A = this chain, B = another copy of it.
């Protein structure tokens, strides 16, 4: 049995083998060195095509051979030293001059054509070319490049629903010309979105089908009554033929997927909303959060996708940006909704959002859900009993404020004290990016506009009242900066907001 490196070599040699390798030339010889049995030979010789034979030949060789020597020797024995040297070189570089292997041996042989093929066969979604959040796309690329030589790993691209994780993941893989081909030998992109108990299992049944996409699948087994161990063993077996595969698990919700990926020792790029699932790992974990688009980033977005570019006209735009809350998913739900190109009809929308929720700006963009709301519903349904409640009472709070704990400790339901409100608030920001916070000068939390617009039309308004006037009882018992302890005396600073209910 070969190791991954010895298999990468064969893989890298493919281009050469397809040109002048005829598996039959090697049968008598390998039978002689006791590597192939007469059966392996017929399983190989019988195929109707040379590529078919090469494919059968390589599966048996990876299983039976214990090193490339016999194959290297064979090629010199058949006067095809050009193939035997390539395999011998690859290995000598791999062992004695790594990090030179890719530059010298691997990279030389690889074209954009081959790269775009790997992507198709990998099921990678077509790369968006309009707006390209360069910073993030290159962070992914840089990290996938420095991690590429770890046996297995987890690169987490986490962020709020719609932040643009998926789009980024695709761009990083489609944009680079090194990653898929040089850094990694191939890729497998699969969308999870599992929520049921058998979701992870179904996920990995596909991975199995994926890794055996070029095997005989005439009698591929129904897996309805197969156990998890068996599914795994089968995936491990199939992995030998697929060295250095990058697995992209799109939209992971259940920590089970992380667990399986780890047991299978895969190299992974995971896109998720709940970074806490990474806690299931014991493997090397790296992260990159897809944060909300900055103020000027929303502009770049609005620019390339049509929208004009600005006194009182600018204000109107700044309002979209405030309501969009830097969420690319929501920002896009605007463009497709603003028939005109006038900041007017644009304003129409903005207002409608201020009048109905987000359901107003309902749409049919390339995103999965109709309204970012439905997309947030799921995040909410995966929260703890307590958190889902704490998150509910955050309704009664101004969007875009750096309000400190004691102030939150009012509306959020619960020796020690209310450090726990901080804990619940720290979780709603970790598991869904529903809220956020800053370490200093003094620890605080914030609730963005879109997530406030969401929270509004989701709780029997009889809960807002009960709370808004339960703060109206905590204010009496006691600007771009944080209100000092002497300020949590009043809530009138934000009255245009605390009263417009």
A1 touches B (CB below 8 Å): yes
Q: How far is the CB of A307 from chain B (nearest CB, A)?
A: 16
B residues in contact with A30, CB < 8 Å: none
A117 touches B (CB below 8 Å): yes
Known: A280-B365, A366-B281, A426-B339. A233 touches B262 (CB 8 A): no
A210 to B226, CA, bound (A): 13
A495 touches B (CB below 8 Å): no
A233 to B241, CA, bound (A): 18
A489 touches B (CB below 8 Å): no
Q: How far is the CB of A425 from chain B (nearest CB, A)?
A: 13
Q: Do the beta carbons of A364 and B3 come within 8 Å of each other?
A: no
Q: Do the beta carbons of B234 and A218 come within 8 Å of each other?
A: yes
A419 touches B (CB below 8 Å): yes
* Stretch from A20-28, A122-130, A313-321, A463-471 contacting the other chain: A122-130
Q: Do the beta carbons of B218 and A222 come within 8 Å of each other?
A: no
* Stretch from A108-116, A134-142, A293-301, A404-412 contacting the other chain: A108-116
Known: A126-B265, A265-B120. A221 touches B234 (CB 8 A): yes
Among B3, B239, B262, the residue within 8 A (CB) of A113 is B3
A336 to B220, CA, bound (A): 42
Q: Do the beta carbons of A113 and B5 come within 8 Å of each other?
A: yes
- 8 Å CB contacts to B: which residues of A252-309? 255, 262-265, 276-277, 279-283
B residues in contact with A151, CB < 8 Å: 116
Q: Do the beta carbons of B221 and A226 come within 8 Å of each other?
A: yes
Q: Do the beta carbons of A279 and B210 come within 8 Å of each other?
A: no
In the complex, per-residue mask of A36-72: 1 if CB is within 8 Å of any chain B CB, else 0: 0000000000000000000000000001000000000
Q: Which residue of B lies closest to A222 (CB)?
A: B225
A217 touches B (CB below 8 Å): yes
A279 to B366, CA, bound (A): 7
- 8 Å CB contacts to B: which residues of A140-171? 151-152
B residues in contact with A339, CB < 8 Å: 426
Among B4, B121, B280, the residue within 8 A (CB) of A364 is B280
Q: Do the beta carbons of A229 and B190 come within 8 Å of each other?
A: yes
A209 touches B (CB below 8 Å): yes
Among B117, B210, B234, the residue within 8 A (CB) of A1 is B117
A415 touches B (CB below 8 Å): yes
A355 touches B (CB below 8 Å): yes
Known: A209-B230, A210-B233. A279 touches B364 (CB 8 A): yes
Q: Could you name 13 residue pairs across A and B whose Cβ atoms are closer than 8 Å?
A: A95-B110, A116-B151, A120-B264, A121-B237, A123-B232, A125-B263, A206-B227, A209-B233, A218-B234, A221-B221, A279-B363, A280-B364, A280-B366
Residues of A within 8 A of B (CB): 1, 3-6, 63, 95, 109-110, 113-114, 116-117, 120-121, 123, 125-126, 128, 151-152, 190, 205-206, 209-210, 214, 217-223, 225-227, 229-230, 232-234, 236-237, 239-240, 255, 262-265, 276-277, 279-283, 336, 339, 348, 351-352, 355, 363-366, 415-416, 419, 426
Starting from the known contacts A190-B229, A209-B230, A279-B336, 19 additional A-B residue pairs (CB-CB under 8 Å) come to: A3-B114, A5-B113, A6-B110, A120-B239, A121-B233, A121-B237, A123-B229, A126-B283, A128-B282, A218-B220, A218-B221, A219-B221, A221-B221, A221-B234, A222-B225, A280-B364, A348-B419, A352-B416, A355-B416
